[PDB]
Amino acid sequence: LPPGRLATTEDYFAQQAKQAVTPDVMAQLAYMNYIDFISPFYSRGCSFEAWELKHTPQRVIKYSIAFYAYGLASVALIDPKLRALAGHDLDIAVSKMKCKRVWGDWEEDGFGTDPIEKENIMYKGHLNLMYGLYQLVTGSRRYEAEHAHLTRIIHDEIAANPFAGIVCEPDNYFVQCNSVAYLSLWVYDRLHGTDYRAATRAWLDFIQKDLIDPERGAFYLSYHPESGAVKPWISAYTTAWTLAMVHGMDPAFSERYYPRFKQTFVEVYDEGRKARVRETAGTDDADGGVGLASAFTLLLAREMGDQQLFDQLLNHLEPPAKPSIVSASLRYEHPGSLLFDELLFLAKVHAGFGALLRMPPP
Amino acid sequence: AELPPGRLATTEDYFAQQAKQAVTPDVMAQLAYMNYIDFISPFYSRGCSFEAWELKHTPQRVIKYSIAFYAYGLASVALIDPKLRALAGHDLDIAVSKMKCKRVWGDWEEDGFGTDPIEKENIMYKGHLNLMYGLYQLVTGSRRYEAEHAHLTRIIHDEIAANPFAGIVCEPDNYFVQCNSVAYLSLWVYDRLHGTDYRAATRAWLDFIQKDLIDPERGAFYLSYHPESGAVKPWISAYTTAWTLAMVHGMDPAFSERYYPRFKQTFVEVYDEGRKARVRETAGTDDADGGVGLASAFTLLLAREMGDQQLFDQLLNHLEPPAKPSIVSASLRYEHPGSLLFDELLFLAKVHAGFGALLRMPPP
Amino acid sequence: LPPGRLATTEDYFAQQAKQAVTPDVMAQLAYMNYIDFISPFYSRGCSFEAWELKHTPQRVIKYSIAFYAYGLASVALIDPKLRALAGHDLDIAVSKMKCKRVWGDWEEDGFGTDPIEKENIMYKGHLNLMYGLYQLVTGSRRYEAEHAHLTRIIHDEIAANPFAGIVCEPDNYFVQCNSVAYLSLWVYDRLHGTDYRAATRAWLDFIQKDLIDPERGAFYLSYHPESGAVKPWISAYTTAWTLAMVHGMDPAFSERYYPRFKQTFVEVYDEGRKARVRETAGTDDADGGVGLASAFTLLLAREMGDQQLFDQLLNHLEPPAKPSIVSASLRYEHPGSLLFDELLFLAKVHAGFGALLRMPPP
Amino acid sequence: ELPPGRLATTEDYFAQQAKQAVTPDVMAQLAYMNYIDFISPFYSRGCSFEAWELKHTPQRVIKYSIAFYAYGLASVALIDPKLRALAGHDLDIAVSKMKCKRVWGDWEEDGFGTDPIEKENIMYKGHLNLMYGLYQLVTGSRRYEAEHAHLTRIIHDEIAANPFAGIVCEPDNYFVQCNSVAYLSLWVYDRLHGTDYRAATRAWLDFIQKDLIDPERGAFYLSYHPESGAVKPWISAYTTAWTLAMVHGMDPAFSERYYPRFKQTFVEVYDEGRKARVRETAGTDDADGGVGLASAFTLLLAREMGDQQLFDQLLNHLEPPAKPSIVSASLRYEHPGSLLFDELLFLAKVHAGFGALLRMPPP
Amino acid sequence: LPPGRLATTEDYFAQQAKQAVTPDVMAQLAYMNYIDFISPFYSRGCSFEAWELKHTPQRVIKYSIAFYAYGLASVALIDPKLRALAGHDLDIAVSKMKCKRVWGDWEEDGFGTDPIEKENIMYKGHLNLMYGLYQLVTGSRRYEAEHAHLTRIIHDEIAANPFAGIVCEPDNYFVQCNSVAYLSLWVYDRLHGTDYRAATRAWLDFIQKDLIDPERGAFYLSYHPESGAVKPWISAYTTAWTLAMVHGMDPAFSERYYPRFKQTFVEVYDEGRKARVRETAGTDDADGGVGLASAFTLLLAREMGDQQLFDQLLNHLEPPAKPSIVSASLRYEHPGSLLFDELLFLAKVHAGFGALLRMPPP
């Protein structure tokens, strides 16, 4: 256990088999749930104190909520004694996701007044996936009408487009964004016996054409239908997120590219004890751009069962953030990026996107 | 010891107030802070002005509690010293009036829950308001708020009757035992004033919170319960337990007597060769006063409610001296309050006559 | 003349006999009238730059204007060459008093939309007294209709109440507040031959029951009719203000209590050269509470002809405030309280409230 | 010789009209006024005030900043025929900016009314009317002629209606400076149109010489207030300097009578006769009290009266401490000593006399 | 390669022939496109985070967008592999140009509510040129209706004016402004076979009368039709911009004046290694006024094939701005003027305005 580490990689990977989260994961759930008013999952109301205190930019809140929700879904699978709590937190997550503070950028930017409108898949992909995970975890049909509506809408946009997929916002196509939307269709299908996921094959064929560099195992940053343009930089954070979710739908896809991804972006250092991830090609700098390459690669390592890389990345990410546990609750004095506690929480618990799809009922 | 530095009066003096029919000079000085200076004192005006709270930096969500806990302390002041009863009644009138201002309840609307704070399931607000209505009337005899009191009491009772679980949610899908304890205690107060039996629901509630929401070995309640999912948050909470046991002791003394010693074994750290004490907020930590930071302060109230002079003295030796009290121009100020609701809770604990004694308050 | 003093006490007390204000009082009038835009009596408009620059809290502005006006009424008596100027300033005073910035707390607090409504005697006592003093000084009937209306309203509230007097705001009765209101009735009577002042005897009998401690010569802070409560602290600032105004209506009342008041509250120090006033009993601290005990005692000493105490108090109050005269205008670098230049101005010129009532016409 | 911290000699400023050229430092001030995109004050006719935001001009002062610039521009036109078109362009902008709510809106914010042309807002409308006139004298353009005729008629009607001679600057506040502007605007209208609105001048000059002036001291009292009859009992140098300067264009003998007394009363010569500064009122040794503009308006007055010695003295006091620099042929002051600082120094440097503006040859 | 320089002048000038941008130009395109939310060309929405982070004043945003767009048009010509990206960025440029944040000064100033009105050529000149360049680069007819409308409007204002050209805003005529508007007509003509550019000869004859000093090779600052005034100062930034654009329409015009311009304004220093430009006559100070003389002269040097001057100017401009390349993206720690990264970007890639007109189709 190096300084600034709270539990072993062996312990994180064993949680599901031990049917128990680690004490530091429990302490993160406490940060999430414990203190009146200021904890993020205190209330279903449209209050965002936790996010104001962390200085989360408004455009990032929707992602904070989503990534917490994805971690909570794995908490439910890990420990049956925590499943009701996870379900409660997911209920709040969905409820908060619907507040104008979360989606309102859509209106402030002049795109429209309803966030469910065409082509806002940034928001509505995550929301749809969250609707599905909430239902898988709890059995509650509270959001089932909305879930069915949003699923139909997403499917209809896919059907209507000459390219395979949907734009994340107007004329901007991102593979990560799509991966969420498609994964939400798999979740709906699991709940309802439908075949919305049929579209997945065409999408996976398409993203393997101009959107990926197959030698390097890396996706380009974005695609823009109106002009045909593919932005000419490859992106590690983009690729890590996309491969992780894709591995739940078509495991062979991600298994093909994962080793090349690592050759391309991952720098191992400190005599093999640590790793950090370059955000693009043609640089030695780690964690450029949005600063999330290492954190999303941590999730990916977990999704691929790569314990060595997980340990290396977490040795780089966690200690400088200066974790402490005060009154059985986890705080980081110096988080190194946006979405920091969210992504470390997620990666520590992540049971695999395929396992979430196959979650036994309650 | 007897008077350590940073202490203003002995525990023996606080406990003797009711028998001496007089508050201590420091309690008088706290009433001065509350009443003296034009505009900026908290109980200066019935209007919707909150300067005292702005100056203390009270967060808006906490104002309702500040007002309530001041009111509970005022109710005991009335019992202590008949010469101060009219003043207490005046301050309670102002308390109730301020409680009704949008600055106090408006979070309900800002959060998107609704436009009327008396609506279903806002018992965080309306529990305290109902209890205050009742205490105002017990202290003064005034029927000024009787109509509103009857209405709010009927509403609360109806929500209890309608729920499959025993009790009411503090806000949607969040059930807190402390919150319920206030609501139920308000029903006892209404019944005292009017001969009704709204308090009949108490037995079912006490059975429910015991079967399910307490760890009986540790003498501690879990943090919250959430009906839609069935979830009980898996941490025990000292502040939650201290507040709940204190109010419960006024309705069913045996309940609190059963758990109080275990509560102390679980949460209370005695230190400094028995002279001091501080309270851990949850299990599995050595840190004192985590979470909302009110474990010690609510335990101080509990100790007073249970007649535990030793623990009271220990807690107050921990809480009061670091806050650096001073009396300037016969008025009490704390240079370094250690928590939210600091002067409110210390005031309350210093005067608290017992929730049962408030129920049995003689008329004026 | 100690350092930080501008004229002798003998000079202040001699102004009326010399028919001239002191140069420092002239310099205060200059502060009040000279500089474009920023002087307080520059304009009848609803502009409050002078008060913004002094940092006057909004609740205090109504008192600032009133106390300036009371000093101006004495300026008019002192020096016939300045009476037109004083009258002009009083006109502006009355006009500014009617602006929403001054009275608008009544609305912000939720009490009502019209400040003349029942039970806002904090505002309407001072306004009614000002209306009267304006007319005594000038002979103008500009405000006579409003004056008659407000006088009738105040009289009706007194008649309607089971206790003698009116509340300053709902359920809060203050003797100072009443003293202003009753003094406004004396002024109306002087201008119109009416007997609104008949109510005074009942009020003076009442305030001498629970409201005063007759041994200590001090009023309690406030009275609250709904509950019957009298706040159990005595207040120097309250008593000093009330005795001063009462001395204009019933001189014997104030003569009875004045010496006891001084025993109770006034601390003489610095080998008899200085004095300061304790705000309540059971403390050695001076000028606690609102911080106006010494300043109102200065006014009281002037009202009672107590030259020694006046000199002592002013030796305490003025020098630390660091007066200077620049371009024949008076500035205090370090005013020690709210209402600082207002109350020192007033006390320096105050001819006695009785003398104001007996002001010869123009 | 050039005294320390000065940009040009007094002899050079006074010679501009005869040389038919402004001095280089005046050119540099015109550059500050006109050169840089967006932030120069005379860049745009739009309701943008960046130049004033950068200088920290209080909003109540903007109307005066614009007016005093315009008066200087009118003299630039007379000085150098090659700059007359530019001056006329700047005056067009001046008038246009003067009509923006940012400039006049205090009238509304103070609760007096919603229209600044109303009644009794002669602080604003005096200057506006004078500017309308000067714009037309400089350019020949009839762009604002309708508005000019309307505002002139209004001003004349208020004078006719008042029992006292003149108009109040705002309600119940009468200021002689304010009136001087209004009356001067009537002379300008009469010059353009052959009318006799100026007939009211004599009655006004007789009136201001009664309670409003101390004739021994050559100084006006601060203000007069009709409703009460009050005259504020302090004399004011800035008030007097401004009033005498404008009055000299209508009745030169009036200002010649009082000017020497004014100087005895207020002007302190110091530094072995090289410098001067002006006391704002009586009974003080302090210079430039009150609004802080006594010296600056006296500088204008000295120029109006041909008093080269006093001009030189005042400018030796005013300019060097303000630390002028010329960067990229444009003038900035690092430490302006008062409000309206660059405006009044500009004006005084170019001022051809208010009478000379009235008799400006056409283009 | 001096310190603070990223590539040689020989390398910038060779880009078109090598069919590749320099690595530092790639890094600038990364700053423009890479990071989610905060990059300037991330989104077509009305969000201006990139400009908020750079502290761009609102009145300058329209020019920032325009000058970026002009550089993008040359990127398209340089590297066919980047042409789709450039087209995408131009689409966004146009879309952002239409947001009220960009044009709203027109309304705030009281001129009107529609920025296409009459006489707002500062905005609509650039918008029209951008419409054209977008279509040249992409072949997309997305804006063709608006382009045709705006071109007609501009042409109609030229036809209606007694002087040759249009005012940039009411009564303010600027030659730079006109040069943009006229160049937009050439672009429209190239796309549609029309002859809107016929008006150019009259305009070029007119600007050579009072508007230029032909000995000094320099334009006066502005012209004002209502009064006939020409502001009597010459301006280097004005002249550099105008001559650069004019060289695309009538090369001989700019060839005539360019050497005189350099004599008048350009100071070579540091033993010939550097140059800086005076903004007006009668000063030794460089980069006065708006502070853009050197930057626009850098563009002009590029337009005229003057490699020596380009190298000299860039040795003055770039090193003090402290460029760094972090994660393959270009940032300047200390930009020396407004529009700094925009104008250096433009000048580094600029292929010539004539070459843009003759851009081969896609």
Ligand SMILES: CC(C)=CCC/C(C)=C/CO
């Ligand atoms: C999380 C951050 C800082 C960027 C995400 C980029 C994007 C548009 C994803 C779509 O779901």
Ligand SMILES: CC(C)=CCC/C(C)=C/CO
């Ligand atoms: C007063 C504080 C800081 C916490 C208590 C909040 C709560 C859920 C009360 C239930 O009546």
Ligand SMILES: CC(C)=CCC/C(C)=C/CO
């Ligand atoms: C002036 C200050 C600080 C308090 C005045 C108190 C009051 C209620 C007076 C009524 O005329």
Ligand SMILES: CC(C)=CCC/C(C)=C/CO
């Ligand atoms: C320019 C400044 C500071 C004062 C002049 C104020 C006034 C009453 C003008 C009358 O036209």
Ligand SMILES: CC(C)=CCC/C(C)=C/CO
């Ligand atoms: C870009 C900057 C600081 C000024 C531009 C001046 C102008 C009116 C151009 C018209 O296209």
